């Protein structure tokens, strides 16, 4: 069992460094912490969601391990803290960026919390998680989605509502609907997931490589049609449609979902991994390239979903080699954390953020699962 060990060792330090340094039983954004942060250093709800993902993912990784009871004992305190960010504001209940109303609120912040909750429900069958997932759902569908830009999900709700439609909110809402459908078999979730996914492919996809642009703004002549695109490609905006395509294949059985998945996967793999020789592993592979670790972890969800369908382990092999390399090299700091800017090792950091550390902890947690299944 090596993969279980790296994951528990790492998450232990993370909890130790970042968790419950406030009265709100939650994650602090940074380590070391300069005392200089709003809300006693509590991470924004985006950072919270990265910590939560690492935990929910660790609850999956640790089932049938020695430490299962240990992580299960931590449910109430993880739950208590993320609920402080759950705020009625302007008569809409959704997760604010800080634990009070009168704060900024975003749809994409929320969907990442929906995703955590639904899967947390999946691991536990405790209703309260599915209840919070439904909260996020309604907000996404009743407020996030509208017919401007030809459809699709908004970005910022408060304080000033934006008008552009984003991959970062629309793609993972497709993923969330699929998981909500799998959790409940209510048709509502599958219909909306397909609408979100079709929106992605129809407005926000580059057909040259099947990768996904960032956002679209309303058409000047007619705001119900799509207008100008921002064509920045970030890994997470492609891995989520990758994940949604796989989930829709598993649910519907239609081959088009899986053909699309293969194509987005090939391109995600050519773009966001790079050839690398590891001295410590004595291997050439493609390493996850220097970048934003949390974007990339969220991208990798799509790969783990796909592997579950076709049993072709060629992408997971690279992700696995990436994280074994990072652990065993100068990426791994003496304080037990990882320099998430560059998994090849060889950069210098003096501050590490929960968003990215939870991101890399989730990747070890998923590798730990595959090791349990001896996959």
CSV table of C-alpha atoms in Angstrom, one decimal:
chain,number,residue,atom,x,y,z
A,1,UNK,CA,0.0,0.0,0.0
A,2,UNK,CA,2.1,3.0,-0.9
A,3,UNK,CA,-0.6,5.2,-2.4
A,4,UNK,CA,-2.8,5.1,0.8
A,5,UNK,CA,0.3,6.2,2.8
A,6,UNK,CA,1.3,9.2,0.7
A,7,UNK,CA,-2.3,10.4,0.7
A,8,UNK,CA,-2.9,10.1,4.5
A,9,UNK,CA,0.5,11.5,5.4
A,10,UNK,CA,-0.1,14.5,3.2
A,11,UNK,CA,-3.7,15.1,4.2
A,12,UNK,CA,-2.7,14.8,7.8
A,13,UNK,CA,-0.2,17.7,7.4
A,14,UNK,CA,-2.8,19.7,5.5
A,15,UNK,CA,-5.4,19.4,8.2
A,16,UNK,CA,-2.6,20.2,10.7
A,17,UNK,CA,-1.5,23.3,8.9
A,18,UNK,CA,-4.8,24.7,7.6
A,19,UNK,CA,-7.8,23.3,9.4
A,20,UNK,CA,-9.8,24.9,12.3
A,21,UNK,CA,-7.6,27.9,13.1
A,22,UNK,CA,-10.6,30.1,13.3
A,23,UNK,CA,-13.8,29.7,15.3
A,24,UNK,CA,-15.6,28.6,12.1
A,25,UNK,CA,-14.3,25.0,11.9
A,26,UNK,CA,-12.9,25.6,8.4
A,27,UNK,CA,-9.8,26.1,6.2
A,28,UNK,CA,-7.4,28.9,6.4
A,29,UNK,CA,-6.2,30.0,3.0
A,30,UNK,CA,-2.4,30.1,3.6
A,31,UNK,CA,0.5,28.5,5.3
A,32,UNK,CA,2.5,30.1,6.8
A,33,UNK,CA,-0.2,32.5,7.8
A,34,UNK,CA,0.7,36.1,8.1
A,35,UNK,CA,-2.1,36.9,10.5
A,36,UNK,CA,-3.0,39.5,7.9
A,37,UNK,CA,-6.1,37.8,6.4
A,38,UNK,CA,-9.7,38.7,6.4
A,39,UNK,CA,-12.0,36.6,8.6
A,40,UNK,CA,-9.0,35.3,10.6
A,41,UNK,CA,-7.4,33.9,7.5
A,42,UNK,CA,-10.4,31.8,6.4
A,43,UNK,CA,-10.1,30.9,2.7
A,44,UNK,CA,-12.7,32.2,0.2
A,45,UNK,CA,-15.3,29.6,-0.5
A,46,UNK,CA,-13.3,28.6,-3.6
A,47,UNK,CA,-10.4,27.6,-1.3
A,48,UNK,CA,-12.9,26.0,1.1
A,49,UNK,CA,-14.2,23.9,-1.8
A,50,UNK,CA,-10.6,22.7,-2.6
A,51,UNK,CA,-10.2,21.6,1.0
A,52,UNK,CA,-13.6,19.9,1.0
A,53,UNK,CA,-12.7,18.0,-2.2
A,54,UNK,CA,-9.6,16.7,-0.7
A,55,UNK,CA,-11.6,15.5,2.3
A,56,UNK,CA,-14.6,14.0,0.4
A,57,UNK,CA,-12.0,12.4,-1.9
A,58,UNK,CA,-10.1,11.1,1.2
A,59,UNK,CA,-13.4,9.6,2.5
A,60,UNK,CA,-13.4,7.5,-0.6
A,61,UNK,CA,-9.7,6.7,-0.5
A,62,UNK,CA,-9.7,5.5,3.1
A,63,UNK,CA,-12.8,3.2,3.2
A,64,UNK,CA,-11.5,-0.3,4.3
A,65,UNK,CA,-8.2,1.2,5.5
A,66,UNK,CA,-7.0,1.5,9.0
A,67,UNK,CA,-7.9,5.2,9.2
A,68,UNK,CA,-11.5,5.1,7.8
A,69,UNK,CA,-13.0,5.8,11.2
A,70,UNK,CA,-10.7,8.7,11.6
A,71,UNK,CA,-11.8,10.5,8.5
A,72,UNK,CA,-15.5,9.6,9.1
A,73,UNK,CA,-15.2,11.2,12.6
A,74,UNK,CA,-14.3,14.4,10.8
A,75,UNK,CA,-17.5,14.7,8.8
A,76,UNK,CA,-19.4,17.0,11.3
A,77,UNK,CA,-16.6,19.5,11.6
A,78,UNK,CA,-16.0,19.7,7.8
A,79,UNK,CA,-19.7,20.1,7.4
A,80,UNK,CA,-20.1,22.7,10.1
A,81,UNK,CA,-17.5,25.0,8.6
A,82,UNK,CA,-18.6,25.0,4.9
A,83,UNK,CA,-22.2,25.7,6.2
A,84,UNK,CA,-21.1,29.0,7.6
A,85,UNK,CA,-20.7,30.1,3.9
A,86,UNK,CA,-24.2,29.0,3.1
A,87,UNK,CA,-26.1,32.4,3.2
A,88,UNK,CA,-29.5,33.7,2.5
A,89,UNK,CA,-28.8,36.9,0.6
A,90,UNK,CA,-31.2,39.0,-1.4
A,91,UNK,CA,-33.7,36.1,-0.6
A,92,UNK,CA,-31.5,33.5,-2.5
A,93,UNK,CA,-29.8,30.7,-0.5
A,94,UNK,CA,-26.4,29.9,-1.9
A,95,UNK,CA,-22.6,29.7,-0.8
A,96,UNK,CA,-21.1,33.2,-0.5
A,97,UNK,CA,-17.3,33.8,-0.9
A,98,UNK,CA,-17.0,34.7,2.8
A,99,UNK,CA,-19.2,33.3,5.6
A,100,UNK,CA,-21.7,36.2,5.6
A,101,UNK,CA,-24.3,37.8,3.4
A,102,UNK,CA,-23.3,41.1,1.7
A,103,UNK,CA,-20.4,39.3,0.1
A,104,UNK,CA,-19.5,38.5,-3.4
A,105,UNK,CA,-21.2,35.3,-4.7
A,106,UNK,CA,-20.4,33.3,-7.9
A,107,UNK,CA,-22.1,30.3,-9.6
A,108,UNK,CA,-18.8,28.6,-10.2
A,109,UNK,CA,-17.9,28.8,-6.5
A,110,UNK,CA,-21.2,27.1,-5.9
A,111,UNK,CA,-21.0,24.2,-8.3
A,112,UNK,CA,-17.7,23.0,-6.9
A,113,UNK,CA,-19.5,22.8,-3.5
A,114,UNK,CA,-22.4,21.0,-5.1
A,115,UNK,CA,-20.0,18.5,-6.5
A,116,UNK,CA,-18.4,17.9,-3.1
A,117,UNK,CA,-21.8,17.5,-1.5
A,118,UNK,CA,-23.3,15.1,-4.0
A,119,UNK,CA,-20.3,12.8,-3.9
A,120,UNK,CA,-20.2,13.2,-0.1
A,121,UNK,CA,-23.8,12.0,-0.1
A,122,UNK,CA,-22.7,9.1,-2.3
A,123,UNK,CA,-20.0,8.1,0.2
A,124,UNK,CA,-22.2,8.3,3.2
A,125,UNK,CA,-25.9,8.2,2.3
A,126,UNK,CA,-26.4,11.0,4.8
A,127,UNK,CA,-29.3,13.1,3.6
A,128,UNK,CA,-27.9,16.4,4.7
A,129,UNK,CA,-25.3,16.4,2.0
A,130,UNK,CA,-27.8,15.7,-0.7
A,131,UNK,CA,-29.9,18.5,0.8
A,132,UNK,CA,-27.0,21.0,0.3
A,133,UNK,CA,-26.3,19.7,-3.2
A,134,UNK,CA,-30.0,20.4,-4.0
A,135,UNK,CA,-29.5,23.9,-2.6
A,136,UNK,CA,-26.6,24.5,-5.1
A,137,UNK,CA,-28.6,22.8,-7.9
A,138,UNK,CA,-31.6,25.2,-7.7
A,139,UNK,CA,-29.3,28.2,-7.5
A,140,UNK,CA,-27.5,27.0,-10.6
A,141,UNK,CA,-30.6,26.3,-12.6
A,142,UNK,CA,-33.0,29.0,-11.2
A,143,UNK,CA,-30.4,31.8,-11.2
A,144,UNK,CA,-27.2,30.6,-13.0
A,145,UNK,CA,-29.0,29.4,-16.2
A,146,UNK,CA,-30.9,31.8,-18.5
A,147,UNK,CA,-31.5,32.3,-22.2
A,148,UNK,CA,-29.1,35.2,-22.7
A,149,UNK,CA,-26.1,34.1,-24.8
A,150,UNK,CA,-28.2,31.3,-26.2
A,151,UNK,CA,-28.3,29.6,-22.8
A,152,UNK,CA,-25.5,28.5,-20.4
A,153,UNK,CA,-24.5,29.5,-16.9
A,154,UNK,CA,-23.5,32.9,-15.5
A,155,UNK,CA,-20.3,33.7,-13.4
A,156,UNK,CA,-20.9,36.3,-10.7
A,157,UNK,CA,-24.2,36.9,-9.0
A,158,UNK,CA,-23.2,39.4,-6.3
A,159,UNK,CA,-22.6,42.1,-5.8
A,160,UNK,CA,-23.0,43.2,-9.4
A,161,UNK,CA,-24.4,40.4,-11.7
A,162,UNK,CA,-22.3,39.8,-14.8
A,163,UNK,CA,-23.8,39.0,-18.2
A,164,UNK,CA,-21.2,36.6,-19.7
A,165,UNK,CA,-21.7,32.8,-19.9
A,166,UNK,CA,-18.7,30.7,-18.5
A,167,UNK,CA,-17.3,27.2,-19.1
A,168,UNK,CA,-16.3,27.2,-15.4
A,169,UNK,CA,-19.9,27.3,-14.4
A,170,UNK,CA,-21.6,25.6,-17.3
A,171,UNK,CA,-19.4,22.4,-17.7
A,172,UNK,CA,-19.3,21.3,-14.1
A,173,UNK,CA,-23.1,21.9,-13.8
A,174,UNK,CA,-23.3,19.2,-16.6
A,175,UNK,CA,-21.1,17.0,-14.4
A,176,UNK,CA,-23.2,17.8,-11.3
A,177,UNK,CA,-26.5,17.0,-13.0
A,178,UNK,CA,-25.1,13.6,-14.1
A,179,UNK,CA,-24.1,12.8,-10.5
A,180,UNK,CA,-27.4,14.1,-9.1
A,181,UNK,CA,-29.2,11.9,-11.7
A,182,UNK,CA,-27.1,8.9,-10.7
A,183,UNK,CA,-27.9,9.7,-7.0
A,184,UNK,CA,-31.6,10.2,-7.4
A,185,UNK,CA,-32.8,9.0,-10.9
A,186,UNK,CA,-34.9,12.2,-11.2
A,187,UNK,CA,-35.1,13.0,-14.9
A,188,UNK,CA,-34.7,16.8,-14.2
A,189,UNK,CA,-31.0,16.4,-13.5
A,190,UNK,CA,-30.3,14.5,-16.7
A,191,UNK,CA,-32.2,17.0,-18.9
A,192,UNK,CA,-30.3,20.0,-17.5
A,193,UNK,CA,-26.9,18.2,-17.7
A,194,UNK,CA,-27.5,17.5,-21.4
A,195,UNK,CA,-28.6,21.2,-21.9
A,196,UNK,CA,-25.3,22.3,-20.1
A,197,UNK,CA,-23.2,19.9,-22.1
A,198,UNK,CA,-24.8,20.8,-25.4
A,199,UNK,CA,-24.2,24.4,-24.5
A,200,UNK,CA,-20.6,23.7,-24.0
A,201,UNK,CA,-20.1,21.9,-27.4
A,202,UNK,CA,-22.3,24.3,-29.3
A,203,UNK,CA,-21.0,27.8,-28.2
A,204,UNK,CA,-17.9,27.3,-26.1
A,205,UNK,CA,-15.8,24.6,-27.9
A,206,UNK,CA,-12.9,25.0,-30.3
A,207,UNK,CA,-13.8,22.4,-33.0
A,208,UNK,CA,-10.1,22.3,-34.1
A,209,UNK,CA,-9.1,20.4,-30.9
A,210,UNK,CA,-12.3,19.9,-29.0
A,211,UNK,CA,-10.9,22.1,-26.1
A,212,UNK,CA,-13.1,24.7,-24.4
A,213,UNK,CA,-12.8,28.4,-24.5
A,214,UNK,CA,-13.4,30.5,-21.3
A,215,UNK,CA,-16.6,32.6,-21.7
A,216,UNK,CA,-19.0,34.2,-24.2
A,217,UNK,CA,-20.6,37.6,-23.9
A,218,UNK,CA,-24.1,38.5,-25.2
A,219,UNK,CA,-24.5,39.4,-28.9
A,220,UNK,CA,-24.6,43.1,-29.3
A,221,UNK,CA,-27.5,43.1,-31.8
A,222,UNK,CA,-29.4,40.5,-29.8
A,223,UNK,CA,-28.5,39.5,-26.2
A,224,UNK,CA,-30.2,36.1,-26.5
A,225,UNK,CA,-27.5,34.9,-28.9
A,226,UNK,CA,-23.9,34.3,-28.3
A,227,UNK,CA,-21.5,37.1,-29.1
A,228,UNK,CA,-17.8,37.6,-28.5
A,229,UNK,CA,-15.7,34.7,-27.1
A,230,UNK,CA,-12.8,34.8,-24.8
A,231,UNK,CA,-10.7,31.9,-26.2
A,232,UNK,CA,-8.3,31.4,-23.3
A,233,UNK,CA,-8.1,27.6,-22.7
A,234,UNK,CA,-7.7,26.4,-19.1
A,235,UNK,CA,-7.4,22.8,-18.3
A,236,UNK,CA,-10.4,22.6,-15.9
A,237,UNK,CA,-12.8,24.1,-18.5
A,238,UNK,CA,-12.0,21.1,-20.7
A,239,UNK,CA,-11.7,18.2,-18.1
A,240,UNK,CA,-15.2,19.0,-16.8
A,241,UNK,CA,-16.9,18.5,-20.2
A,242,UNK,CA,-14.6,15.4,-20.5
A,243,UNK,CA,-16.1,14.2,-17.2
A,244,UNK,CA,-19.6,15.1,-18.2
A,245,UNK,CA,-19.2,13.2,-21.5
A,246,UNK,CA,-18.1,10.1,-19.7
A,247,UNK,CA,-21.0,10.3,-17.1
A,248,UNK,CA,-23.5,10.8,-19.9
A,249,UNK,CA,-22.2,7.7,-21.7
A,250,UNK,CA,-22.5,5.7,-18.4
A,251,UNK,CA,-26.1,7.0,-18.0
A,252,UNK,CA,-27.4,6.9,-21.6
A,253,UNK,CA,-25.3,4.4,-23.3
A,254,UNK,CA,-25.0,6.6,-26.4
A,255,UNK,CA,-21.7,6.2,-28.2
A,256,UNK,CA,-21.5,9.9,-29.2
A,257,UNK,CA,-20.7,10.8,-25.5
A,258,UNK,CA,-17.8,8.4,-25.4
A,259,UNK,CA,-16.4,9.4,-28.9
A,260,UNK,CA,-16.4,13.0,-27.7
A,261,UNK,CA,-14.7,12.0,-24.4
A,262,UNK,CA,-11.8,10.3,-26.3
A,263,UNK,CA,-11.2,13.5,-28.4
A,264,UNK,CA,-11.2,16.0,-25.4
A,265,UNK,CA,-9.0,13.6,-23.4
A,266,UNK,CA,-6.4,13.2,-26.2
A,267,UNK,CA,-6.2,17.0,-26.5
A,268,UNK,CA,-6.2,17.7,-22.8
A,269,UNK,CA,-3.3,15.2,-22.7
A,270,UNK,CA,-1.3,16.7,-25.5
A,271,UNK,CA,-1.7,20.2,-24.0
A,272,UNK,CA,-1.4,20.0,-20.3
A,273,UNK,CA,1.2,17.3,-19.9
A,274,UNK,CA,4.8,17.5,-21.2
A,275,UNK,CA,7.6,15.0,-21.9
A,276,UNK,CA,9.8,14.6,-18.8
A,277,UNK,CA,12.6,12.3,-17.6
A,278,UNK,CA,12.6,11.5,-13.9
A,279,UNK,CA,15.9,10.9,-12.2
A,280,UNK,CA,14.3,9.7,-9.0
A,281,UNK,CA,12.0,7.3,-10.9
A,282,UNK,CA,14.4,6.5,-13.7
A,283,UNK,CA,11.5,6.9,-16.1
A,284,UNK,CA,10.4,9.0,-19.1
A,285,UNK,CA,6.7,9.8,-19.0
A,286,UNK,CA,4.5,12.9,-19.6
A,287,UNK,CA,4.4,15.0,-16.4
A,288,UNK,CA,1.5,17.3,-15.5
A,289,UNK,CA,3.1,20.6,-16.6
A,290,UNK,CA,3.9,23.6,-14.4
A,291,UNK,CA,0.6,25.3,-13.9
A,292,UNK,CA,-2.3,26.0,-11.7
A,293,UNK,CA,-2.6,22.8,-9.6
A,294,UNK,CA,-6.3,23.1,-8.8
A,295,UNK,CA,-7.3,23.7,-12.4
A,296,UNK,CA,-5.3,20.6,-13.3
A,297,UNK,CA,-6.8,18.4,-10.5
A,298,UNK,CA,-10.3,19.4,-11.7
A,299,UNK,CA,-9.1,18.5,-15.3
A,300,UNK,CA,-7.9,15.1,-14.0
A,301,UNK,CA,-11.4,14.2,-12.8
A,302,UNK,CA,-12.2,13.7,-16.4
A,303,UNK,CA,-9.4,11.2,-16.9
A,304,UNK,CA,-10.4,9.2,-13.8
A,305,UNK,CA,-14.0,9.1,-15.0
A,306,UNK,CA,-12.9,7.9,-18.5
A,307,UNK,CA,-10.6,5.3,-17.2
A,308,UNK,CA,-13.5,3.8,-15.3
A,309,UNK,CA,-15.2,3.2,-18.7
A,310,UNK,CA,-12.6,1.9,-21.1
A,311,UNK,CA,-9.9,0.6,-18.8
A,312,UNK,CA,-7.2,2.2,-20.9
A,313,UNK,CA,-4.7,3.3,-18.3
A,314,UNK,CA,-2.4,5.4,-20.5
A,315,UNK,CA,-3.5,8.8,-19.1
A,316,UNK,CA,-3.7,7.7,-15.4
A,317,UNK,CA,-0.1,6.2,-15.8
A,318,UNK,CA,1.1,9.7,-16.5
A,319,UNK,CA,-0.8,11.3,-13.7
A,320,UNK,CA,0.4,8.5,-11.4
A,321,UNK,CA,4.0,9.0,-12.4
A,322,UNK,CA,3.6,12.7,-12.0
A,323,UNK,CA,2.5,12.4,-8.4
A,324,UNK,CA,5.0,9.6,-7.4
A,325,UNK,CA,7.7,11.8,-9.0
A,326,UNK,CA,6.6,14.9,-7.1
A,327,UNK,CA,6.5,13.1,-3.7
A,328,UNK,CA,9.9,11.5,-4.2
A,329,UNK,CA,11.7,14.7,-5.6
A,330,UNK,CA,12.6,18.3,-4.6
A,331,UNK,CA,8.9,19.2,-5.1
A,332,UNK,CA,8.2,17.6,-1.7
A,333,UNK,CA,9.2,20.2,0.9
A,334,UNK,CA,10.5,19.3,4.4
A,335,UNK,CA,7.3,20.7,5.9
A,336,UNK,CA,5.6,17.8,4.1
A,337,UNK,CA,3.8,19.9,1.4
A,338,UNK,CA,4.5,20.1,-2.4
A,339,UNK,CA,5.5,23.0,-4.7
A,340,UNK,CA,2.2,22.9,-6.7
A,341,UNK,CA,3.6,25.3,-9.3
A,342,UNK,CA,5.9,22.7,-10.7
A,343,UNK,CA,5.7,19.0,-10.0
A,344,UNK,CA,9.1,18.3,-11.7
A,345,UNK,CA,10.6,19.9,-8.6
A,346,UNK,CA,13.3,22.6,-8.5
A,347,UNK,CA,11.3,25.7,-7.8
A,348,UNK,CA,11.3,27.6,-4.5
A,349,UNK,CA,8.2,28.5,-2.5
A,350,UNK,CA,7.8,29.9,0.9
A,351,UNK,CA,4.0,30.1,1.1
A,352,UNK,CA,1.4,27.4,0.1
A,353,UNK,CA,-2.3,27.9,-0.5
A,354,UNK,CA,-5.1,25.5,0.6
A,355,UNK,CA,-6.7,25.7,-2.8
A,356,UNK,CA,-3.7,24.0,-4.5
A,357,UNK,CA,-2.7,21.7,-1.6
A,358,UNK,CA,-6.2,20.3,-1.4
A,359,UNK,CA,-6.0,19.9,-5.1
A,360,UNK,CA,-2.9,17.8,-5.0
A,361,UNK,CA,-4.2,15.8,-2.0
A,362,UNK,CA,-7.3,14.9,-4.0
A,363,UNK,CA,-5.0,13.4,-6.7
A,364,UNK,CA,-3.2,11.2,-4.1
A,365,UNK,CA,-6.6,10.3,-2.7
A,366,UNK,CA,-7.8,9.1,-6.2
A,367,UNK,CA,-4.6,7.2,-6.8
A,368,UNK,CA,-5.2,5.6,-3.3
A,369,UNK,CA,-8.7,4.4,-4.6
A,370,UNK,CA,-7.3,2.8,-7.7
A,371,UNK,CA,-4.8,1.0,-5.5
A,372,UNK,CA,-7.6,-0.4,-3.4
A,373,UNK,CA,-9.3,-1.7,-6.6
A,374,UNK,CA,-5.9,-2.8,-7.8
A,375,UNK,CA,-6.6,-0.8,-10.9
